[PDB]
Amino acid sequence: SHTADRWRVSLDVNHFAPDELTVKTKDGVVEITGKHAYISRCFTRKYTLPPGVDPTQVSSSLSPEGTLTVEAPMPK
């Protein structure tokens, strides 16, 4: 009654200009990695999920401007 909460974060990935991004969810942590390539450049950024989030329901999208949005349904 009557709320559908979401966890959501966004990353400006334009400057890094990844050749590939990976979004991995495990042990209540979301790990985002980018690789660009020498010189090869690599970054890793981690987020702690709120308690109760189902790892299979974490999704992401990359906008043409180079912003990566990652999100997931909140348990309750």
UniProtKB/Swiss-Prot annotation:
Domain sHSP: residue ranges: 2-76
Result after altering residue 56 to I: In HMND3; no effect on homodimerization; no effect on client proteins binding; no effect on function in chaperone-mediated protein folding
Modification N6-acetyllysine occurs at: 35
Coiled-coil ranges (or none): none
PTM entry text: Phosphorylated upon exposure to protein kinase C activators and heat shock. Phosphorylation by MAPKAPK2 and MAPKAPK3 in response to stress dissociates HSPB1 from large small heat-shock protein (sHsps) oligomers and impairs its chaperone activity and ability to protect against oxidative stress effectively. Phosphorylation by MAPKAPK5 in response to PKA stimulation induces F-actin rearrangement.
UniProt modified residues of type Phosphoserine: 10
Tissues in which the UniProt entry reports expression: Detected in all tissues tested: skeletal muscle, heart, aorta, large intestine, small intestine, stomach, esophagus, bladder, adrenal gland, thyroid, pancreas, testis, adipose tissue, kidney, liver, spleen, cerebral cortex, blood serum and cerebrospinal fluid. Highest levels are found in the heart and in tissues composed of striated and smooth muscle.
Disease the record associates with this protein: Charcot-Marie-Tooth disease, axonal, type 2F: A dominant axonal form of Charcot-Marie-Tooth disease, a disorder of the peripheral nervous system, characterized by progressive weakness and atrophy, initially of the peroneal muscles and later of the distal muscles of the arms. Charcot-Marie-Tooth disease is classified in two main groups on the basis of electrophysiologic properties and histopathology: primary peripheral demyelinating neuropathies (designated CMT1 when they are dominantly inherited) and primary peripheral axonal neuropathies (CMT2). Neuronopathy, distal hereditary motor, autosomal dominant 3: A form of distal hereditary motor neuronopathy, a heterogeneous group of neuromuscular disorders caused by selective degeneration of motor neurons in the anterior horn of the spinal cord, without sensory deficit in the posterior horn. The overall clinical picture consists of a classical distal muscular atrophy syndrome in the legs without clinical sensory loss. The disease starts with weakness and wasting of distal muscles of the anterior tibial and peroneal compartments of the legs.
Name of the protein in question: Heat shock protein beta-1
Source species: Homo sapiens (Human)
Gene that this sequence comes from: HSPB1
Residues represented out of the complete protein: 90 to 171 of 205
